[PDB]
Amino acid sequence: DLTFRLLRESFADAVSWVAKNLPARPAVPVLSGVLLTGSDNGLTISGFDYEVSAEAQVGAEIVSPGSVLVSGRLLSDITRALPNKPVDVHVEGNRVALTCGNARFSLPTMPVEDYPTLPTLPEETGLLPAELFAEAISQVAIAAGRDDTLPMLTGIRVEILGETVVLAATDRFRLAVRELKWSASSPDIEAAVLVPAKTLAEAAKAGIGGSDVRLSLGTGPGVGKDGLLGISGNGKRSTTRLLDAEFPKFRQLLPTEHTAVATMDVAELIEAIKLVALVADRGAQVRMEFADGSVRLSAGADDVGRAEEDLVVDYAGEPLTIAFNPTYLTDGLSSLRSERVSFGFTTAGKPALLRPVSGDAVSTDYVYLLMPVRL
Amino acid sequence: LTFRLLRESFADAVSWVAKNLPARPAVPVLSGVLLTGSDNGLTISGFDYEVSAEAQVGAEIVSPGSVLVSGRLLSDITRALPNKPVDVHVEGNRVALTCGNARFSLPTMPVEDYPTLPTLPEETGLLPAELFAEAISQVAIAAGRDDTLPMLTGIRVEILGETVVLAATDRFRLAVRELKWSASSPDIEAAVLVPAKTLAEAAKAGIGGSDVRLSLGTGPGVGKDGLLGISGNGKRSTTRLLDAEFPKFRQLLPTEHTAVATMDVAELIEAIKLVALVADRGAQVRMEFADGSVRLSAGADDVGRAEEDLVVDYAGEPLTIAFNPTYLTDGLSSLRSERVSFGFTTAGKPALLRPVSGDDRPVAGLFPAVSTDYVYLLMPVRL
């Protein structure tokens, strides 16, 4: 009942996006599948699990309408490996015929009724330039520390205030808040919700074309407990369930006046961190020793090596000697899309403030809170 | 010991010696790189169970003497330093290292407790670094993978006059390479087995257009040193030889064919990766040679089925033959030729692949096959 024809690249691009974030999974077989729907004008490619859904619609010559359920990872891997010709697709009983140039395929099909029905639209709360979203999330997500660790509730907080968006991501060592200006598709609206880095970042990492990223949480009176978040892009559209966990109240953590402040060249600092960090322990510390006109960046191993570098800086205040985890600090410096950096600390046991200095519930546009280490 | 020299000259010569070194093996002293200064200048020296590396470079030797610092640590520092001259002097039990605004204080290990690097055998002959690098990458694939089967883990290296012949094999593929050589040596007839892991790596570290000296010896006592020297401009390494018997491989290769074929290489690699996406477990890919057209095909109990028809030249009775996807593909990459030649006998016996667009005559003196400088022999599969 289903027959379509489109360009290989378009079909490859559409599937990969629906079959990356959420699939790549064998948990329940009846759900490794991706749904192909042959609407009168285009092909829609659908997919989800129990929480995060994804949908892609692309141009097609659908000769016969209908739908079909085929292996997720497989189709992706196939469409990318196929020739740069058009591809023809026919469903024959419960097998799918797929021809692209001189290559034939036959894939086992799954029953179209077993597949869950996707989530809908939480009404458009507003939109913003995809480049901005790409940056915002890209910055903040550096701080929701999650690598080889168990995924403790790992989320980027998203707050809407009239037309002011605030993105906050933290673990417990670092806190990254970013502010954002918004074409808010509703009157002044207030919304503070939590949605896990995992997916959110990817929708943004898509690195969408233009000013078309479209945040769907509803225009209502706060989006309800229907834990949904829609991202809509140029044809690409994905929902994701939002966590029930509560974010810290970050405004608290941020100081107004800080006992001491200085500024230095980002590039140069990142090169010297990695320089002296080479000798840093498994208890990774790096010692910054602030004085007028200069900082003595040093680190050491309690056994095997010692390192130090004098760097120029514009310091001002009562000298501070303080240490950081070289990786969380360098994450910060990188996070700042700035040539130079503002440092705002209070005590060698109180958070230090990383702000971008591109000279010539938040404070400036990008703010980055870093916990110190002791001795 | 005190000396000065440029960051890059130091970095390059330390990371060359320290790459083969282990971060923390059984004996601590083996993790370290030996730094010696004399009339010649600074010398980077590293030893191992099986490889010894040594690099000589110019430095201003302010004070002769040797020292023992962590091999991998010194490599990491000298790479990260700002591009300014580096200063080193040994303070009692520690090394001070000064480059611009950065200063380092590394700890030493006891220097008397470092062995003397095994001595280089006489030069057996020499060949451009480039060929050496290609010939190994070519043959190294076929090397029997990490197993309790040593005979297969080696790369065989045999010298016949002005000809060198390189071989490797797991019991499923066999790769032979033939080179033109400059043996500064007379009769020169020898055969040796060296570990593929180490050889490949030592030949990966060979580029730029220069030459490379192979040192096993020259007399009847050739390769009998238990070592292989490979050296050039200041850089000198030896690798332990492998005491195992290599297979009598020349016998293994067919001399004539029931069926030959040729086809486009990049075209064939690409189509292989396509159909095998659907193959059982990367287990097999079925080729169906007819005249003019070969049907590449793959399947899986119930995962999917695939088919490509590729433009082949053929001569002989339409053979149908299964190969392993990966082994097949390695073989193809292993020829750096634009096209490929196929030699077959039965669906259950070896296929012989060689580069096509290559008019080198491996010259004589003392339906068919043919002469090539490189062959890759693949066993087939079924079910």
Curated annotation (Swiss-Prot), chain B:
| Stored Gene3D superfamilies | DNA Polymerase III, subunit A, domain 2 (3.10.150.10)
Keyword tags: Antibiotic resistance, Cytoplasm, DNA replication, DNA-binding, DNA-directed DNA polymerase, Nucleotidyltransferase, Transferase
Q: Which Pfam families match?
A: DNA_pol3_beta, DNA_pol3_beta_2, DNA_pol3_beta_3
Biological-process GO terms, alphabetical: DNA strand elongation involved in DNA replication; response to antibiotic
Q: Where in the cell is it found?
A: Cytoplasm
Q: Which domain of life is it from?
A: Bacteria
Q: Which family does it belong to?
A: Belongs to the beta sliding clamp family.
Record's NCBIfam families? dnan
Q: What else is known?
A: Strains that are resistant to griselimycin occur at a very low frequency and are associated with amplification of a 10.3 kb chromosomal segment containing this gene as well as the ori site, suggesting antibiotic resistance may be due to overexpression of the wild-type protein.
Q: What is this protein called?
A: Beta sliding clamp
Q: What is the lineage of its organism?
A: Bacteria, Bacillati, Actinomycetota, Actinomycetes, Mycobacteriales
